[PDB]
């Protein structure tokens, strides 16, 4: 049972898989750069300096790795590199212990599909006592075991001796990340994505001079591919994280810069770099063509091949006369329909019986596939994958480009137009520029119904109509969510806040993503004002997508009694005219005490008053209230964060929170004093005694009389 | 408002594919050289139908009526009724619904009212026995087309309830590479307001032609009289050859005209079905576009269907060109190894297309 699972699909090529991607993540001053340089120098026997941008090396005959030192204070970089990564070398200061950046990143990974996390602890050489050392390692390990699973192992790294960590511990780390054995995840194996390796602008410099350093320059992007075969026909939509949502102009594949030695030697075999074994560019050292030729008429196509409206349904036939004369007989279709003589009779009877039964009980697949419904499903998957394999292998140029496009691990360059000068200007190498092919559902806009809860570690709850910078799909954008409840599934009422410890429905405007999709939203992407508080604020999953919602806010009208009889009351101060009351006549009105009612007829001489009947003599002091609903609407704000376009690449400031603007404008948190609660103290009430009419009291008999 | 299309060709197919894709289209020069240039009543009502069934779409139509602009939204469906104008019948107004049924946010319960047969558009029995099986093979299970009142040309007054409940996520990829073996010949011979003698005459004509074969034939007579038999009289027949092994069907139908001969129509449709058998390869020429669309929308994988060079025709050609213009999805064709015939496997990489409207 333990080894069963939920069948999925592994869309990765057997043939030339790409370099796996390892993201080195953690707090700022924690030996992250040294860790990468030492890992590289172990795996390729070459000390390195000036590391920046994705650095791709090769391990073993069949593996190769892409290291990304993610920046140490950018929440947006954390989010997107965690969307894309595969192995997270998550690293921890030792003398200090766990840190908020680490916790935030771990949460992002957990919500977007956890990659193979793998923790390494540094600064272990500053412990004075080997006892505190041991206790602290054990505590880190167990807290880590809570976050990542249990038994997950972390590595320990004493001090740098010569700008490098000890060879033994690094050797163990290297072999582990050499037999890592990654696993399939829905988002990655449903989208195509790449992590750009090199960036090159493209315009003509005189054209730049003429336009005035403003024209939106063409851009070339070089890198491998991952996930799902990118369609090779130009003009697909790819979101570049933090830069915008573009569409590709021109595609082209190339020879990869660091081919695995197995591939290299197999290439040398077929035909009949050893010194640069790494790659850090961002650092320094026929019917078918007849079908699809457009300039040809379909008539021309068909005549050449042999040598019409589609609205009508019946296809084009010939004269019944010719038809019947042609087929007085059916022998030309009898084949489709269905001692030595005795043996032939037995064989034809077997054929008849095989047509009769056939694939009715052809092995059931079950005893064939080891009697485990999981493995049966998995066998279906694998058989489909191998069908794909052989059909693609059938033919070279089209099956590879026109049919499926560039599979994965195929080092491609792409050029876009209309890319901001700000991007090309402020682009520094230390940030990952990641691209993801979108989907139609993901290019449309509408409003999404999700369910989200306040993130358990965030100290404050989330008010409606306060902007939330959420991350969903490849995107990060700021929106105005509205949090709704279903009053036991009668209507969708807006709440004023977020339940402290449970999931409330939310609805908000923004780009659409397929249902059942997880997402997580923060409040402050700006490094400038983060404080010591935990950053991630909301987590949820999108349930459904549409273009509008019926969403209700409650409002009650308050009225006041001023002349009461038994069961009838005159209510003033609730409407403004007799037309108004007459529109509202016949209403379930109930008072604070809880006695039901209705408003019967609009009173005449006073302008708005009315007479209402209750189920009991209402007080004079009570208050009557009428429940009614009011439709609200969802704000259509959408402000997609673009830190890469920004120059600081942190302190992206968007819409401010309500409390923030109130403090800035020096207002007060509004509150009318009659809405507050108070410690009332209800005293006992002595009711008057009965008083019989004098008529009755005179008519009573003598015994049962008040003596 | 971006992808351009010319002429009034395959209008419903283009609009259907626009909805399924999601990208905005624009069809210009609809019957420019006409005394009444522009659309027709049935096309306008078909756009009305699309607007009803979906949500959030935008339809722009030229004051000349010669160009139309389509910016789609998402499919919803729900329950509804439609009044098909008499110019075209309900089969014409149902086929696009057969395409868009099982990817909707809510099940389809649509009541069509109008005429229910014509020479150019699929009849009720045609839709049932000739397209529901294809959908079932592709994965949809609970699809049904009840016939409340059966009209006929030229007054009609017929009613059909189309119900679809199998909200799949995307059609299963298909693997059919072998010419099937016909098991039986089923048929429906219906009529409204005339003599069961006439219907039996059709039956005898068809069975007369088909006695040459050995496969069993069962044709059910469907005579309607009284009130729920619609206004005008009429008759028609529809034959299906069913391969029960994997559940495949090839069908051909027709309807009698004013002053036709029942036995003559019967022999015509019998020969006509068995013609479609001769030309066919795992699919009839008239079922084929449905099969192709379901393949191209199936999940990101290679599906295979064995077709014949006769099914390869200019209608197929224009269909595939429109599909490329919409989806950018080439279709690979590979000749079979068989030396006797010249069948070709059509191999299609269905893009990942998800029923992203359905709530969880």
């Amino acid at each position: 049972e333990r080894k069963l699972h939920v069948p999925m699909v592994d869309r990765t090529p057997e043939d030339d898989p790409p370099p796996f991607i390892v993201a080195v993540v953690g707090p700022p001053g924690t030996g992250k750069t040294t860790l990468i340089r030492s890992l590289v120098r172990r795996m390729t026997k070459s000390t390195l300096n000036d590391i920046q941008g994705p650095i791709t090396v090769v391990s073993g005959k069949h593996r190769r790795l892409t290291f990304l030192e993610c920046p140490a204070d950018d929440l947006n970089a954390m989010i997107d590199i965690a969307k894309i990564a595969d192995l997270v070398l998550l690293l921890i200061d030792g003398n200090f212990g766990f840190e908020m950046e680490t916790m935030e990143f771990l949460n992002i990974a957990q919500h977007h599909g956890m990659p193979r996390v793998l923790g390494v602890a540094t600064h272990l050489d500053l412990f004075k006592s080997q006892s505190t050392l041991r206790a602290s390692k054990k505590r880190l390990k167990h807290r880590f075991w809570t976050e990542v699973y249990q038994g997950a192992k972390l590595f320990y790294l004493s001090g740098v001796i010569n700008g490098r960590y000890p060879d033994r511990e690094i050797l163990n780390l290297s072999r582990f990340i050499s037999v890592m054995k990654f696993r399939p995840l829905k988002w990655r194996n449903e989208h195509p994505y790449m992590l750009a390796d090199r960036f090159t602008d493209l315009t003509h410099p005189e054209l730049i001079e003429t336009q005035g350093l403003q024209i939106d320059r063409k851009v070339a992007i070089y890198g491998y591919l991952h996930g799902t075969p990118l369609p090779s026909a130009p003009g697909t939509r790819v979101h570049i994280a933090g830069v915008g949502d573009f569409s590709v102009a021109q595609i082209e594949k190339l020879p990869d810069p660091c081919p695995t030695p197995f591939y290299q030697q197999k290439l040398d075999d077929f035909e009949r770099d050893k010194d640069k074994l790494i790659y850090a560019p961002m650092s320094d050292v026929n019917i078918g063509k007849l079908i699809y030729m457009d300039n040809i008429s379909p008539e021309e196509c068909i005549r050449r091949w042999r040598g019409v409206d589609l609205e009508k349904f019946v296809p084009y036939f010939d004269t019944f006369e010719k038809l019947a004369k042609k087929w007085k007989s059916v022998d030309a279709i009898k084949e489709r329909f269905l001692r030595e003589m005795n043996a032939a009779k037995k064989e034809k009877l077997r054929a008849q019986f095989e047509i009769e039964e056939g694939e009715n009980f052809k092995e059931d697949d079950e005893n064939n596939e080891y009697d485990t419904w999981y493995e049966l499903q998995k066998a279906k998957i694998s058989k489909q994958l191998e069908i794909n394999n052989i059909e693609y292998q059938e033919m070279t140029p089209e099956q590879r480009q026109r049919i499926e496009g560039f599979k994965a691990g195929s080092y491609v360059r792409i050029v876009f137009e209309k890319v901001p000068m700000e991007f090309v200007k402020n682009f520094n190498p230390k940030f990952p520029i990641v691209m993801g092919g979108l989907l139609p559902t993901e290019i449309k806009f509408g409003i999404v119904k999700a369910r989200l809860r306040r993130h358990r570690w965030h100290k404050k709850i989330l008010k409606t109509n306060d902007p939330l910078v959420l991350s969903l799909g490849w995107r990060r954008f700021q929106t105005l969510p509205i949090y709704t409840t279903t009053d036991s599934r009668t209507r969708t009422r807006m709440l004023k806040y977020t339940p402290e410890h449970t999931y409330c429905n939310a609805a908000f405007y923004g780009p659409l993503c397929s249902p059942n999709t997880p997402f997580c939203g923060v409040q402050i992407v700006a490094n400038s004002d983060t404080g010591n508080g935990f950053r991630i604020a909301a987590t949820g999953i999108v349930e459904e997508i549409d273009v509008n919602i019926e969403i209700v806010k409650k409002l009650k009208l308050v009225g006041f009694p001023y002349k009461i009889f038994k069961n009838t009351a005159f209510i003033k101060d609730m409407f403004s005219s007799a037309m108004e009351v007459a529109r509202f006549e016949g209403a379930q009105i109930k008072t604070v005490s809880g006695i039901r009612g209705e408003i019967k007829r609009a009173l005449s001489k006073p302008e708005g008053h009315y007479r209402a009947a209750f189920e009991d003599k209402i007080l004079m002091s009570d208050i009557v209230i009428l429940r009614s609903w009011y439709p609200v609407r969802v704000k259509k704000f959408y402000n997609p964060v673009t830190s890469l376009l920004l120059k600081e690449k942190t302190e992206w400031k968007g819409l401010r929170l309500t409390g923030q603007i109130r403090a800035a404008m020096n207002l007060e948190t509004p509150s009318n004093p009659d809405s507050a609660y108070h410690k009332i103290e209800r005293v006992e009430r002595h009711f008057n005694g009965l008083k019989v009419p004098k008529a009755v009291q005179k008519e009573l008999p003598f015994k049962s009389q008040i003596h | 408002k971006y992808t351009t299309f010319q002429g009034s060709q395959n209008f419903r197919l283009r609009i259907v594919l626009a909805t399924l894709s999601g990208k905005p289209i624009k069809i210009e020069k609809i019957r420019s050289g006409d005394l009444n240039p522009g659309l027709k009543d049935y096309e306008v009502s078909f756009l009305r139908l699309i607007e009803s069934v979906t949500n959030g779409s935008v339809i722009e139509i030229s004051y000349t009526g010669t160009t139309v602009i389509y910016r789609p939204g998402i499919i919803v469906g729900g329950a509804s009724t439609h009044i098909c104008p008499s110019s075209k019948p309900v089969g014409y107004f149902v086929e696009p619904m057969l395409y868009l049924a099982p990817f909707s946010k809510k099940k389809f319960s649509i009541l069509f009212k109008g005429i229910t047969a014509s020479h150019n558009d699929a009849g009720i029995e045609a839709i049932k026995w000739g397209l529901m099986p294809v959908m079932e093979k592709f994965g949809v299970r609970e699809c049904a087309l009840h016939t409340l009142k059966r009209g006929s040309p030229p007054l009609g007054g017929g009613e059909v309830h189309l119900v679809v409940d199998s909200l799949i996520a995307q059609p299963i990829t298909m693997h059919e590479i072998d010419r099937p073996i016909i098991s039986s010949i089923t048929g429906v011979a219906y009529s409204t307001r005339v003599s069961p003698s006439l219907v039996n005459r059709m039956i005898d004509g068809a069975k007369k032609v088909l006695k040459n074969l050995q496969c069993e034939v069962n044709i059910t007579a469907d005579v309607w009289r009284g009130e729920n038999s619609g206004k005008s009289p009429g008759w028609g027949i529809t034959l299906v050859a069913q391969s029960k092994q994997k559940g495949w069907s090839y069908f051909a139908e027709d309807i009698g005209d004013a002053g036709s001969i029942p036995e003559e129509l019967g022999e015509k449709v019998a020969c006509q079905l068995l013609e479609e058998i001769s030309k066919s390869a795992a699919v009839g020429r008239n079922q084929l576009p449905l099969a192709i669309v379901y393949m191209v929308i199936g999940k990101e994988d290679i599906g295979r269907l064995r077709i014949n060079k006769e099914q390869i025709d200019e209608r197929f050609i224009i269909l595939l060109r429109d599909i490329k213009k919409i989806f950018n999805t080439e279709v690979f064709l590979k000749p079979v190894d068989e030396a006797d015939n010249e069948d070709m496997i059509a191999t299609i990489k269905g893009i990942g297309f998800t029923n992203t409207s359905k709530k969880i």
Binding site: - | R48, V58, Y63
Partner: peptide, 14 residues
Amino acid sequence: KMMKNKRGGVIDKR
């Protein structure tokens, strides 16, 4: 009911 529940529109001009 129809105007309250529907969202998308048809624009007809002649």
